[PDB]
Design a protein around this nucleic acid. Structure first.
Length: 51
DNA sequence: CACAAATCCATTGACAAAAGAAGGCTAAAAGGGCATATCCTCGGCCTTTG
């Protein structure tokens, strides 16, 4: 929901794409950073988790 | 009980090192942007089909 608020703040309909097609990016990024930041007890940085 | 050598005491100079104290440099950690739209089961639910 936080990520979706962020995407809603950035949506421009001048292009004509669906809102889903844009906001899905910010939503999935928000959720992924959330899991990578606050899911392990010992916090691994995000790039190391990608590795 | 009187005079000179022997030896604990304290500074000087020079200085090697230990301790920081910064400045610089990476790599590491954080942050940001992204523009087609949208699996399997089960079961209701309704179209079509007879």
């Amino acid at each position: 929901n936080i990520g979706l608020m962020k995407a809603v703040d950035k949506f421009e309909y001048r292009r004509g794409y669906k809102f889903s097609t844009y906001a899905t990016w910010w939503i999935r990024q928000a959720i992924t950073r959330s899991i990578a930041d606050q899911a392990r007890t010992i916090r691994i940085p995000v790039h190391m988790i990608e590795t």
